[PDB]
Design an enzyme around this catalytic site. Sequence first.
Site, PDB file in Angstrom:
ATOM      1  CG  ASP B  49      77.367 -63.746  29.502  1.00  0.00           C
ATOM      2  OD1 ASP B  49      76.384 -63.432  28.800  1.00  0.00           O
ATOM      3  OD2 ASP B  49      78.465 -63.452  28.842  1.00  0.00           O
ATOM      4  CG  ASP B  55      74.819 -54.042  21.124  1.00  0.00           C
ATOM      5  OD1 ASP B  55      74.646 -54.762  22.305  1.00  0.00           O
ATOM      6  OD2 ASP B  55      75.047 -54.157  20.133  1.00  0.00           O
ATOM      7  CD  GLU B  78      73.596 -55.267  12.786  1.00  0.00           C
ATOM      8  OE1 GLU B  78      72.757 -56.107  12.558  1.00  0.00           O
ATOM      9  OE2 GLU B  78      74.662 -55.401  12.705  1.00  0.00           O
ATOM     10  CD  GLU B  79      71.855 -55.146  17.332  1.00  0.00           C
ATOM     11  OE1 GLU B  79      71.809 -55.812  18.295  1.00  0.00           O
ATOM     12  OE2 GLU B  79      72.743 -55.386  16.338  1.00  0.00           O
ATOM     13  CG  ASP B  99      74.491 -50.692  13.070  1.00  0.00           C
ATOM     14  OD1 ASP B  99      74.387 -50.936  14.210  1.00  0.00           O
ATOM     15  OD2 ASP B  99      75.403 -51.115  12.473  1.00  0.00           O
ATOM     16  CG  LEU B 101      76.189 -48.623  19.787  1.00  0.00           C
ATOM     17  CD1 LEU B 101      76.514 -46.998  19.876  1.00  0.00           C
ATOM     18  CD2 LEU B 101      75.460 -48.633  21.202  1.00  0.00           C
ATOM     19  CG  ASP B 102      79.627 -48.462  12.836  1.00  0.00           C
ATOM     20  OD1 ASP B 102      80.058 -49.269  12.163  1.00  0.00           O
ATOM     21  OD2 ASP B 102      80.352 -47.381  13.098  1.00  0.00           O
ATOM     22  CD  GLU B 261      76.086 -51.604   8.743  1.00  0.00           C
ATOM     23  OE1 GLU B 261      77.484 -51.447   8.409  1.00  0.00           O
ATOM     24  OE2 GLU B 261      75.643 -52.722   9.510  1.00  0.00           O
TER      25      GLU B 261
END
Lengths: 316, 316, 316, 316
Positions: B49, B55, B78-79, B99, B101-102, B261
């Site tokens: 969707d 990201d 992070e992912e 990370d 794409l913070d 981070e």
Amino acid sequence: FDTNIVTLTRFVMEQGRKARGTGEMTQLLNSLCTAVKAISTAVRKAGIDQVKKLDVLSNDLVINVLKSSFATCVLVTEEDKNAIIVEPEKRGKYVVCFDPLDGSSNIDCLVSIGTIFGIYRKNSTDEPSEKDALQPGRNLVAAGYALYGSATMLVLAMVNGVNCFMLDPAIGEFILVDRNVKIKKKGSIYSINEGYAKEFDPAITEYIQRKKFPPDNSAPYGARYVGSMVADVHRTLVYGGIFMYPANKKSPKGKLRLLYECNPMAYVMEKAGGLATTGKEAVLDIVPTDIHQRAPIILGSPEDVTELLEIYQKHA
Amino acid sequence: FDTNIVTLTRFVMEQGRKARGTGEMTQLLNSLCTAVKAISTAVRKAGIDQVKKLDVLSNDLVINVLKSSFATCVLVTEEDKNAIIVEPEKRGKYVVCFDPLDGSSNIDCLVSIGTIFGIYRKNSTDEPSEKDALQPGRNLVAAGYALYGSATMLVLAMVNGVNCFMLDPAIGEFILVDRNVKIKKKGSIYSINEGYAKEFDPAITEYIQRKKFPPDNSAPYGARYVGSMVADVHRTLVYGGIFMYPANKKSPKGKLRLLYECNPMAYVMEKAGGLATTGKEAVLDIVPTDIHQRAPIILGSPEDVTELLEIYQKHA
Amino acid sequence: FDTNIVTLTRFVMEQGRKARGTGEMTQLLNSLCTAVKAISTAVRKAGIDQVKKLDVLSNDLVINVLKSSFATCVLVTEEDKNAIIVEPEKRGKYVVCFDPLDGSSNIDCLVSIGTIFGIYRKNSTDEPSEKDALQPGRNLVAAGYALYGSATMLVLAMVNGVNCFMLDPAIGEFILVDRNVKIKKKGSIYSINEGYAKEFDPAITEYIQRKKFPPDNSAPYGARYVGSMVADVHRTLVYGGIFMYPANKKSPKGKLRLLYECNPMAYVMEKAGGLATTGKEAVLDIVPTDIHQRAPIILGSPEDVTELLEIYQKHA
Amino acid sequence: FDTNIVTLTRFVMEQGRKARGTGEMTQLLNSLCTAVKAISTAVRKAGIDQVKKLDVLSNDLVINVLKSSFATCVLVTEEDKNAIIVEPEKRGKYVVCFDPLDGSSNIDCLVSIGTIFGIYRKNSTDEPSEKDALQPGRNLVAAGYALYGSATMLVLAMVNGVNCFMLDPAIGEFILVDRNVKIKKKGSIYSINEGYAKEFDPAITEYIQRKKFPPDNSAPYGARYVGSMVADVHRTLVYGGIFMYPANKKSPKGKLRLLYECNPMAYVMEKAGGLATTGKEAVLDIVPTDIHQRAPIILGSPEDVTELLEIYQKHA
């Protein structure tokens, strides 16, 4: 949004770590890629006392940027007679030769212009560096060029195959566009300045005419000469034909200084099924008596380059 | 037309060949630079969707591109929970955490978003690689980030100084813009989400109020919180103040997962005169019990970060 | 490469054709977008008289760009002493008040910044046509702002709707990306400078804490303050909250200039079904008396501004 | 950042104001430049139905872009069956015949390619308005071509002069870079397809060798043939020579279509004080009878075309 970005700058690495040595090759190439970027742009805003400038300013560019991949021993420019020996705390295994902008002030007709480059590896020990390393032909490790046309293709021919890359202007990277180019062995176009040399041509005169007047029932070869050395080598790599610049009477014949013009150009051709012939010798197998030695070339598809020596020797 | 192009990609080299080792560091950095380019653009055409995508698609990107500088042993996103161990015929000395794409879907307000990255060097021998190398704090070799704002600054803090670079969109290169950044030791701005935590704040409550209500005749500190971790660390590096994200009740306190981070962010601060404090310990000197460990941070100018421990300890 | 390329122009040109007008709107906006674009590039590489320059250049660029469209006649600027009265030769019916780079020197911390403008129609006969043609309250025919963030967004509001276009740098055109756009009832983040305004906040205090730790019981507000009008307002157009800069000392309170900061922004907010008051007067109904009149502003989602007003009633 | 930014628009808009017109010229050219720009990007990264696509996309993009300016009414294209008659709702007074990508599939050898166009005015009452509105000979009001080489150059010719604009990609505007431009008497390079046309060249033969090895004694001609109309003509506008594609079999000789290849180009050449004939008829005075009429062309510097004509007299 397109995840497998296959940049030159890691592609060369994928065959080069599958071989050890030292990076150097890639650091050199990569640095050459920045300067090439740099030139493509100032040329895309082309012309926004006066004599020349752009080019000499970019030879400026090619030098230090080549002199900062810590990977050069000595440079040879079209623009500089003498090799410029790279510094102690900056030298690395390699020797380059480059016409930094074949066509610098013939831009006016928004015609194709380019940066031809030829890389050698200094190796012959404590000498220390000096101009002599500009000595073989058939031993350049890495050779290719960069045509800033509708686009900015950087074609890189090395040791084991010809690759073409494209400048992607969205991300500042040269991207693998065709992986292992080989030349249309015949079926052709032919290119020469038929004004300037038509009267002045030699054995090669009848050559053109059986390429015009078909010794036959064959339809004829088409004329196509852009008058830039890069634009015209590339259209021969791609659609395939024969390019020839002799220039008869004074005979280290044409403007094309062997060593950084017709010698990159010879190896890139050579590695795609390309004959590169002086017409008597083979352009790669000639040792540079001097580093600025103008010297002619015929190159192109093999069954065409070869029909030209069949001209030349049962003749001269 | 501007000849001394001082790109990241040779700058890191100028301190790194003045040190030997192996290139690797630069091949890693350089590759990280392509992917960062790559993201800056798809974000500059943001939403030309449906749930998330951008990201995660770029975490995709950061990985292989990091996995093709032959210079990584293991990655921690992070992912992705677990470190993804880089392959045999692709491993090299180093461990990264990122990370990618913070701020991935808070873009809508054309607010600043970023790629935070932290690099480690695997060294502890035949183990072979595996997730454990995600173990120190105060030992990341190289750390920094990349804010895609009005521009795309990549600030790179290493071993011996903080550097800021700028994306030049004309040539696809990060260019040295400021050479050795140091933090406005006090004189300030302060940043915290004073809605969310105001009621929930602890010792730090009186902190804000003597930063609002001047225990004095001093004019007061200004509020400024963009709500993005990168945008807000950078405005503290540059104009100088104190950033703080605790998040009181559950206390590995805030969203900021330590390790990719607040740990890059801690070393980049650390190297510019920046204190990076949990409020009780020092964020760099904490060993990661687990690789996804959320853990708070206060950072900023020293005489300000230090006024906060004078809050915290004669208090709690 | 899709060919129904709906540029800002075609949007503006369809609309001037419905209204049966003369085509000035279309060339004005067209001129203005030439500056929005070059300013958006100026900023993408800033960092690469001398105390302040980039503001001015922007303002000269925007006056120049606006005079050349014969479509304008008075131009009021953050920078110039008084109105600029366009030479009889380059005149037309519109009046533009604009701020060329809002937040101009708070751009190294790299945050979004922008250009704001409001367009009147000159309705009297001659005068010839001076600054009194900026009496109008809400008699704008068009207003909007250009946001120079990670993408350059031009939100434009006119008689029928607010619409959002985005600059596609692959072609240099503001493309129509989002339509009609209404803001959403209530739904929040409260954006305010929490420091100083906290030492001067009257009814706003009550409001701050009524929305910090809620009395009708449950879930609190976030705070967000970028520190830039364009930025804090645009975020407010997309996500929902409330925005306030009433700040007391500077007692026509506000740095926010009425003609070219607060009234455009009120206009857009209002056209998107959100309100903006003084807390006492509606911003758009206030008459001017000075073209450099500072006026206090509070704006954003309906419910949220009404909440603040319910409180400004039985208060101060 | 200079603010007297003279875009194509402002050039076209100053001129429609002298002529006291309606503003259609300005929006037509404006529409057209939106396509020239996106086509110029299409090509900058080509290589990165399916037998041929890029031509068509270009032609859909240019019809679409032209219909939206209400300013046009018949559109004749290299690709479509017959004229496109613009819907009463989007009409205006001009008639445009255009080739969208000349040399479309000869673009990997990376040479310049382009879009050519000529603009008529529809002068009868209704009809309603069909393809017969392309009878006109030299009744163009404007003609020009967009050249997609190492820079994208739009040479535009109208009633008063030929002017040359260049696309500055830092802002996406064709900027005015060169003015009025006349070609220079004689001064040459002869551009012709030297192969086949050599097997069919009648008076042209004499001319070729009269200009190869000269009879009035001294200095010869160069040859240059890119193989692309836009390219070989543009070079001819800047440097001096002669251009010819008369080629015999295809006996309304020429691939060069009269409405949208030869007449625009004749127009520009003629407005710059250079001529273009059939060798028999002037190209611009020829009436059409087919909108897809092929017509033979020879064009370029005066003296040079007159030389060829002096010869076409006592000849064939």
